[PDB]
Structure 1
Amino acid sequence: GLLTDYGNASASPWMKKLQSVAQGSGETFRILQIGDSHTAGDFFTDSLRKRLQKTWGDGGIGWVYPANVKGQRMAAVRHNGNWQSLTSRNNTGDFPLGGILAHTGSGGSMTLTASDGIASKQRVSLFAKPLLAEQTLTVNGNTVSANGGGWQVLDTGAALPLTIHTEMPWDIGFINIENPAGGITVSAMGINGAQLTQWSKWRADRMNDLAQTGADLVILSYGTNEAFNNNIDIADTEQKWLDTVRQIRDSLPAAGILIIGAPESLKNTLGVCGTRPVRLTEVQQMQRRVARQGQTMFWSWQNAMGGICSMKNWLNQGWAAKDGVHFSAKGYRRAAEMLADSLEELVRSA
């Protein structure tokens, strides 16, 4: 239906891991959604998170921002500290996978508090880059040290609330917080306005960061912004997309991949139906071709909405924002519940 599998999900390593989690293996099945503002608002991914965690187990909050990010949102944690975030939306830098870092400063402090939470000791990992090799920081009072310099992942253990102190400056990327009993996590790596090809803004070794997320299913949710580029080169874009899928597979050989086809957007909300941006249809079609050629799964958000000429109706009923591009909280929740529906069906039939 909405979900088309161009691979062989039932025969896959990731499905086998999901099923055993489903039967109480204690493993953690890690779903990672990387995308644009639809993802960055966390309304879509948090609905997916809550639904699939009830179905298959609360594996914890997963990979979250190291600090508040202007215009973006984490539903599962709250931040209180003096770290300063920076994203690839408007800036350049040495970004780890996801395009977000935070400068801690000296005398730096950040406390993460779970919006719900089970305050037992979680597994904690952090993307981190020290100013100096061998530099330390503390996580709930425990000393954690870098090995050499450059971006790396620090592994430790602590409970929530989680307090991280930096005597000297570091850059920090996403921070993974997992419950030791296992289950599902859903991590949201969104950037307002982003396009898939703009992973090129991130550091050259970004695929090694991806390898270290532990993601068992990678969801790519882009298309809306590509669609608003009147001068986009579909043939070039398609090759870059295929390259990116190839690279994801090389970096995470056991992971599933799901491409979320762009929802309907409107260049202008006038008159019952139109008007679609001129390149939207070509972008959505490219996405499906990439899915098939890359043997990934494909979920048509436009079809989930009711197909072509559905956005104005969604807008009229408050499921989509007035701009005819972004959705309202309940609109995102609705779309994600349909995706969750689609995935549970797939597993059930396996």
Structure 2
Amino acid sequence: LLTDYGNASASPWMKKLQSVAQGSGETFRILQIGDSHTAGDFFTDSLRKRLQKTWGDGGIGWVYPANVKGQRMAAVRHNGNWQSLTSRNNTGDFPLGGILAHTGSGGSMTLTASDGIASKQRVSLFAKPLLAEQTLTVNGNTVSANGGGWQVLDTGAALPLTIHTEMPWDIGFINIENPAGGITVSAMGINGAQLTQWSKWRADRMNDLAQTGADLVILSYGTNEAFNNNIDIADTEQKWLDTVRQIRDSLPAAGILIIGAPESLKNTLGVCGTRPVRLTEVQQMQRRVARQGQTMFWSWQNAMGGICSMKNWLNQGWAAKDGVHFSAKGYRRAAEMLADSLEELVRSA
């Protein structure tokens, strides 16, 4: 299921994960960026709870600044007055990930962890203040910008977290990491997104990517590319290759895992089919990019039983009625196979 077209065992990130597994106390950061399967958080949260039991709870990682309509965070509940906006249907000066929230004046947001937390955690925010040296507060502590523009505010707090803004700010993702180290899985999804649609994000998005501190980037797209009957594979392959090349430029020390689209059905009509017309070209392309870019490739379709399997998963309650999206227990099944593959790769070093 997992093919390594690079050199996993020799990699700097491998060495970091190993070090964390003995309890170096560092944080190993997994950042999954992708479409609806990522945006729902069922895949990533299942992945999170497993790799955290295996190698340590590093915290929730990077989460939304506010509720995002039709999208989901599993590790935090949001309660407040900020208004989110995403690159899905809209234009905006987006930080990496396509999500921001307007705090407005006298704004307020509380993040409460679905489980237990206790102590001070490391907190980091993508933020952009209206005025240059502006402030907000985090559990009552004044936290200050330096100059204007998008930037990362480094602070510390315990959960639950309350962020007060007297005057307007735009807030991106928020990082929340356990100081004792371990693993974080961060879900940066947009419903319906394609990998090339990072272009909708601000020009410095890669400078944001470098700041996420990710040690392993999981790129999970392909489903909606496959739904464009008129997609141009060669050009798409170039832009995909360019994205891999740029991730490597600004995250020189990270692993890259490309998850090939799972089987989707244009029609659940008839036993087996019918697949989208361009699904196989897309799937194949994703593997070519993985090998040329020397990345890891995990075949979601092969994890399902290969071709003509989505109908099986549909019948078994693993997939949603539409034949594209999965059920919550369907995603848990997929992600667990991936976690399997990962631990398998690690143990073999």
Instruction: Report the TM-score range of the alignment, normalised by the length of the smaller protein.
Output: over 0.9
Paired with 2:62 and 2:273, the residues of 1 have a C-alpha distance of 38
Root mean square deviation of aligned Cα: 0.4
Q: Secondary structure at the match of 1:69?
A: coil
Paired with 1:227 and 1:157, the residues of 2 have a C-alpha distance of 43
C-alpha displacement of 1:270: 1.1
Paired with 1:271 and 1:310, the residues of 2 have a C-alpha distance of 13
Paired with 2:270 and 2:306, the residues of 1 have a C-alpha distance of 17
Q: Secondary structure at the match of 1:185?
A: strand
1:35-88, CA deviations, whole angstroms, 9 ceiling, x for partnerless residues?
000000000000000000000000000000000000000000000000000000
C-alpha displacement of 1:22: 0.4
Paired with 1:224 and 1:212, the residues of 2 have a C-alpha distance of 28
1:206-245, CA deviations, whole angstroms, 9 ceiling, x for partnerless residues?
0000000000000000000000000000000000000000
Paired with 1:305 and 1:150, the residues of 2 have a C-alpha distance of 45
Paired with 1:90 and 1:348, the residues of 2 have a C-alpha distance of 43
C-alpha displacement of 1:317: 1.0
Paired with 1:272 and 1:263, the residues of 2 have a C-alpha distance of 18
Q: What is the number of residues matched between the two proteins?
A: 349
C-alpha displacement of 1:253: 0.4
Match of 2:38 in 1: 39
Paired with 2:151 and 2:232, the residues of 1 have a C-alpha distance of 35
Paired with 2:116 and 2:202, the residues of 1 have a C-alpha distance of 33
C-alpha displacement of 1:117: 2.5
> Normalization by structure 1: what TM-score?
0.99
Paired with 1:141 and 1:37, the residues of 2 have a C-alpha distance of 36
Paired with 1:336 and 1:126, the residues of 2 have a C-alpha distance of 28
**2:121 is aligned with 1:101:** no
Paired with 1:122 and 1:310, the residues of 2 have a C-alpha distance of 43
Match of 1:263 in 2: 262
Paired with 1:110 and 1:119, the residues of 2 have a C-alpha distance of 19
Paired with 1:252 and 1:278, the residues of 2 have a C-alpha distance of 35
C-alpha displacement of 1:188: 0.1
Paired with 2:145 and 2:228, the residues of 1 have a C-alpha distance of 42
Paired with 2:256 and 2:115, the residues of 1 have a C-alpha distance of 29
Structure 1 residue runs of 4+, over 6 Å off? Answer: none
Paired with 1:156 and 1:339, the residues of 2 have a C-alpha distance of 33
Q: Secondary structure at the match of 1:61?
A: strand
| Structure 1: segments with no counterpart, 5+ residues | none
Paired with 2:203 and 2:118, the residues of 1 have a C-alpha distance of 37
C-alpha displacement of 1:339: 0.2
Paired with 1:66 and 1:211, the residues of 2 have a C-alpha distance of 19
C-alpha displacement of 1:118: 1.6
1:21-45, CA deviations, whole angstroms, 9 ceiling, x for partnerless residues?
0011000000000000000000000
Paired with 1:259 and 1:333, the residues of 2 have a C-alpha distance of 18
Alignment of 1:48-87 (within 5 A): 48-87=47-86
Paired with 1:61 and 1:117, the residues of 2 have a C-alpha distance of 11
1:107-129, CA deviations, whole angstroms, 9 ceiling, x for partnerless residues?
00000000113221000000000
Paired with 2:288 and 2:30, the residues of 1 have a C-alpha distance of 23
C-alpha displacement of 1:319: 0.3
Q: Secondary structure at the match of 2:286?
A: helix
C-alpha displacement of 1:271: 1.1
Q: Secondary structure at the match of 1:345?
A: helix
